[PDB]
Amino acid sequence: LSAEDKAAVERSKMIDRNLREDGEKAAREVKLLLLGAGESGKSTIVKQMKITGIVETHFTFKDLHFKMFDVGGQRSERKKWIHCFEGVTAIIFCVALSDYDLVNRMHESMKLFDSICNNKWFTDTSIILFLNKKDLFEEKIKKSPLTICYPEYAGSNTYEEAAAYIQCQFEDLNKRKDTKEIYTHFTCATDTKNVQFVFDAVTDVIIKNNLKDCGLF
Amino acid sequence: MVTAITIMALYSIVCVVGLFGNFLVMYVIVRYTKMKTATNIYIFNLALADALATSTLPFQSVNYLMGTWPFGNILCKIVISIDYYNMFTSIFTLCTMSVDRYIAVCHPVKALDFRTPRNAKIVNVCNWILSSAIGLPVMFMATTKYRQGSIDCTLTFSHPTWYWENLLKICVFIFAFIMPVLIITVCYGLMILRLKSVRMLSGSKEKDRNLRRITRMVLVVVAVFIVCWTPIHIYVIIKALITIPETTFQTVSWHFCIALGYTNSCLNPVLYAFLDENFKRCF
Amino acid sequence: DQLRQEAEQLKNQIRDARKACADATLSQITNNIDPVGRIQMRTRRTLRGHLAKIYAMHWGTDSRLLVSASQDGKLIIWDSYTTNKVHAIPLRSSWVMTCAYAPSGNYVACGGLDNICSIYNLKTREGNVRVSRELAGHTGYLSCCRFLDDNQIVTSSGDTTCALWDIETGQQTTTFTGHTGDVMSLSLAPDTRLFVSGACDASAKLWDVREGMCRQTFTGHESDINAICFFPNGNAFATGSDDATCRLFDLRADQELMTYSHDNIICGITSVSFSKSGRLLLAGYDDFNCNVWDALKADRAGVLAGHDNRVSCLGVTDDGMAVATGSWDSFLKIWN
Amino acid sequence: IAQARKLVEQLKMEANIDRIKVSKAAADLMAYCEAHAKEDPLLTPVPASENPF
Numbered sequence: 001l002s003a004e005d006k007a008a009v010e011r012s013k014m015i016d017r018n019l020r021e022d023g024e025k026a027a028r029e030v031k032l033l034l035l036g037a038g039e040s041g042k043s044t045i046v047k048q049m050k051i052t053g054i055v056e057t058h059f060t061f062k063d064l065h066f067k068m069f070d071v072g073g074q075r076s077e078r079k080k081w082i083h084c085f086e087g088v089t090a091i092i093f094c095v096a097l098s099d100y101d102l103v104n105r106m107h108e109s110m111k112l113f114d115s116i117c118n119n120k121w122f123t124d125t126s127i128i129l130f131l132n133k134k135d136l137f138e139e140k141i142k143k144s145p146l147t148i149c150y151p152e153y154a155g156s157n158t159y160e161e162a163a164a165y166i167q168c169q170f171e172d173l174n175k176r177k178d179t180k181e182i183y184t185h186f187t188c189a190t191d192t193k194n195v196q197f198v199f200d201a202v203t204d205v206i207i208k209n210n211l212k213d214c215g216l217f
Numbered sequence: 218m219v220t221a222i223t224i225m226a227l228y229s230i231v232c233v234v235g236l237f238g239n240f241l242v243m244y245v246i247v248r249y250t251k252m253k254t255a256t257n258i259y260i261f262n263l264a265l266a267d268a269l270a271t272s273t274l275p276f277q278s279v280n281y282l283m284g285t286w287p288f289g290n291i292l293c294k295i296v297i298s299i300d301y302y303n304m305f306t307s308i309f310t311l312c313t314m315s316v317d318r319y320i321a322v323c324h325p326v327k328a329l330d331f332r333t334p335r336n337a338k339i340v341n342v343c344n345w346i347l348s349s350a351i352g353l354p355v356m357f358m359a360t361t362k363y364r365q366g367s368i369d370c371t372l373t374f375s376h377p378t379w380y381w382e383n384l385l386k387i388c389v390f391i392f393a394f395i396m397p398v399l400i401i402t403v404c405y406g407l408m409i410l411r412l413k414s415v416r417m418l419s420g421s422k423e424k425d426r427n428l429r430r431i432t433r434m435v436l437v438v439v440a441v442f443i444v445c446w447t448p449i450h451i452y453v454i455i456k457a458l459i460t461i462p463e464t465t466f467q468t469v470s471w472h473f474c475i476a477l478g479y480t481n482s483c484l485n486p487v488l489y490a491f492l493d494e495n496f497k498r499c500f
Numbered sequence: 501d502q503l504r505q506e507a508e509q510l511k512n513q514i515r516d517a518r519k520a521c522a523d524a525t526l527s528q529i530t531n532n533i534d535p536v537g538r539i540q541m542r543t544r545r546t547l548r549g550h551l552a553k554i555y556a557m558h559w560g561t562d563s564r565l566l567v568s569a570s571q572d573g574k575l576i577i578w579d580s581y582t583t584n585k586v587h588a589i590p591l592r593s594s595w596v597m598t599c600a601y602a603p604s605g606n607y608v609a610c611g612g613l614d615n616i617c618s619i620y621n622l623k624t625r626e627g628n629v630r631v632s633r634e635l636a637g638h639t640g641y642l643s644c645c646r647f648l649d650d651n652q653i654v655t656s657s658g659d660t661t662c663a664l665w666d667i668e669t670g671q672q673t674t675t676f677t678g679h680t681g682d683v684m685s686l687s688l689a690p691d692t693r694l695f696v697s698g699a700c701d702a703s704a705k706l707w708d709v710r711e712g713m714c715r716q717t718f719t720g721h722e723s724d725i726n727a728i729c730f731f732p733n734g735n736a737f738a739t740g741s742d743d744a745t746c747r748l749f750d751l752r753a754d755q756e757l758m759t760y761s762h763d764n765i766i767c768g769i770t771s772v773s774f775s776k777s778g779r780l781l782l783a784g785y786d787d788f789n790c791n792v793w794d795a796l797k798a799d800r801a802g803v804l805a806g807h808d809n810r811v812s813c814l815g816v817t818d819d820g821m822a823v824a825t826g827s828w829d830s831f832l833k834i835w836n
Numbered sequence: 837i838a839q840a841r842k843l844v845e846q847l848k849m850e851a852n853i854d855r856i857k858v859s860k861a862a863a864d865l866m867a868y869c870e871a872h873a874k875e876d877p878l879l880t881p882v883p884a885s886e887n888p889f
């Protein structure tokens with residue numbers, strides 16, 4: 001009975017301890033999943049923050065560690081591997097705002113957003129909608145009316161109303177408004193507040209998760 | 218004897234519900250959930266220390282009826298000590314659950330380190346250790362003394378009585394009423410203020426039903442603790458400062474007030490377990 | 501061109517040819533066989549070390565050691581009899597969807613969502629395990645990989661292709677390109693001379709390693725398929741699909757032979773495996789439990805309910821003594 | 837346009853195989869399946885002395 005098997009059991013205990021330690025260490029990083037249409041702004045986004053199938057991007061801010069996976073180079077049935085990613089802390093959806101005229105493209109991006117938002121696996125995951133290229137939207141709205149992309153729209157052909165209308169168009173595609181929250185932001189080149197916005201949204205999500213775990217819903 | 222009917226009845230009611238509810242809780246918590254997360258550890262220890270403190274009661278029931286301690290010096294020291302011990306180690310779990318909840322809401326980013334299911338195991342063990350600072354000294358000083366009528370359990374303190382008998386009474390007051398009431402109020406106080414400004418819990422008629430539910434659940438917890446623990450402490454101190462001639466009503470009031478103390482251990486499963494969101498989410 | 505309609509002639513010639521050779525109703529040949537009865541199995545082990553969903557599993561030819569990969573970034577090697585752990589390999593890419601474990605017992609393989617199959621060396625000097633090589637060259641993502649020798653490994657990826665590598669060289673020796681959808685599983689014949697694969701076309705094919713050409717194609721599923729397994733005789737295989745319908749094909753008669761289904765099952769199937777004698781067919785569902793079909797009369801013979809989330813891997817030892825199931829529960833059970 | 841040439845070449849090769857009648861191919865599944873029923877521990881329960889688990 002257990003002559004030198006004791007050495008085997010000791011080895012088992014040691015590597016079990018190492019497993020537990022590595023798991024506890026990796027359960028304090030926050031994971032973000034970066035969708036987005038075809039090179040809409042996804043390349044631009046990773047520049048502002050500190051900085052083959054998928055590529056991670058580890059970065060830190062205010063003593064918090066973010067990992068951010070993008071899957072743009074994975075051409076396959078998204079249904080067959082999207083379930084790997086359930087349990088990410090948040091989705092970052094990136095939308096180019098100057099694409100309402102080039103080709104319709106906005107309609108396709110809204111279709112993708114609707115497909116991702118209401119998936120059977122992301123029924124609770126919060127998403128952050130980033131809207132890029134607001135600068136070009138200035139001198140693209142001057143000549144081409146937004147009615148080109150939204151024929152049922154009646155309002156001033158100015159930036160202030162157009163941006164709010166587009167944000168409202170996107171923000172009401174979620175069929176479950178009582179469980180998931182959608183954060184929105186108009187990107188700004190300088191004034192590195194983008195990462196600040198991400199930080200705020202992620203902190204609220206952590207608060208909700210802790211409230212769930214403590215038993216207060 | 219109308220009084221003897223009530224006094225015997227009141228303790229019996231408390232004891233039966235306490236054992237029934239608490240032993241059920243430990244059964245469900247380990248059969249199905251198996252102690253995966255930090256909170257479930259805490260509920261178990263509260264359930265455990267509530268079950269033990271309730272099982273001491275029947276020995277106090279027979280003592281009232283006979284006025285004699287039949288169980289001898291063997292059991293006297295092990296009954297009184299496990300009664301003072303469980304008072305502190307039940308209260309301190311309540312204080313630890315509150316300090317835990319406040320961290321997880323008001324300091325979300327630093328809570329990624331303090332809150333780990335291993336650290337919950339350290340605190341609970343370190344909680345039972347610190348309770349023994351009063352569990353053990355009463356074990357050694359517990360004694361049985363024969364009196365004019367019969368044998369009664371009592372703690373003979375030391376050579377001076379005026380300077381040491383009151384020390385235990387005053388010390389238990391500060392470290393089992395003032396500190397608990399203080400920290401479970403402030404910690405729950407600042408939680409509610411922060412929950413106002415959470416984008417998830419404000420903006421819709423259905424959202425605020427969630428905020429209403431949370432502030433009701435938190436407020437109930439403090440209310441029960443205050444009502445179920447204040448009367449006995451104030452009644453002990455008053456009896457230490459004035460004669461209180463032994464009237465039949467004084468006997469009626471005193472034993473009822475003691476039963477009110479144990480009501481805290483019976484209600485805990487309904488508040489902390491039967492109202493827990495996860496408990497409903499598995500039945 | 502007129503070819504696109506001429507192919508329709510052949511696709512109609514075949515259907516009638518294999519119709520002319522179907523007088524069986526295998527359910528009629530096998531009405532005089534005494535039933536299996538009832539099968540009760542009880543968990544005899546429970547291996548508990550993983551911290552996330554587990555996606556694959558594979559026994560060793562010893563029928564004692566098994567390897568299991570989860571998505572926490574750890575593929576560990578257990579020991580069934582005494583539930584120890586003999587290795588815990590930390591790997592670079594946290595996204596993994598497959599395992600293999602060489603017949604000799606020297607190497608393991610592991611690929612995933614990063615298109616690279618990595619071969620780890622176990623029996624080495626200096627103690628711990630080291631990455632012997634990293635095979636690269638796929639475009640989709642690894643979905644299954646199996647060993648032939650200590651030197652050749654066959655993989656099936658999500659870009660509608662399979663391949664046959666050579667390890668020391670590190671290059672694709674052969675490529676099989678006939679599917680039109682993703683490739684989800686793989687199974688080698690007992691003699692390792694030809695294998696079958698199952699794709700998202702509701703179709704399975706039969707290649708052969710030496711030449712590199714598919715020989716037969718079997719259709720009959722209404723949706724995607726996720727699992728394959730040879731009948732031990734090397735003359736039939738069973739598939740699992742998203743209809744909740746296993747079914748058994750025949751290599752020589754060249755068509756469907758029986759179908760397994762039930763009306764109160766609307767779920768999906770994630771893994772399939774045969775018993776040692778081939779009498780009874782295991783199968784793992786998303787219902788959180790796996791059934792046990794009698795592979796000769798198509799009626800159930802019991803269940804194995806012990807998990808709290810869908811089962812994603814399943815296997816039977818070489819000597820036919822135990823079955824091991826793993827699940828997104830993050831635990832692994834060894835029934836018997 | 838090239839796939840049509842490749843595809844038709846495939847169906848030509850796959851349409852010339854010597855099939856066998858299924859009853860012949862179903863008896864073999866029957867015979868093998870019962871000429872091994874003795875040594876299948878999952879089907880016939882194994883005595884607890886010889887059960888390593």
Ligand SMILES: CCC(=O)N(CCCCCCNC(=N)N)C1CCN(CCc2ccccc2)CC1
Nearest residue numbers: 270296297300303304307370450478479481482
């Ligand atoms: C300041 C309060 C006080 O002085 N108490 C406790 C009063 C009961 C409250 C206990 C609730 N516990 C819980 N876990 N909820 C003391 C009251 C007196 N008892 C005496 C014991 C005893 C008496 C006779 C023979 C055997 C034992 C000792 C404790």
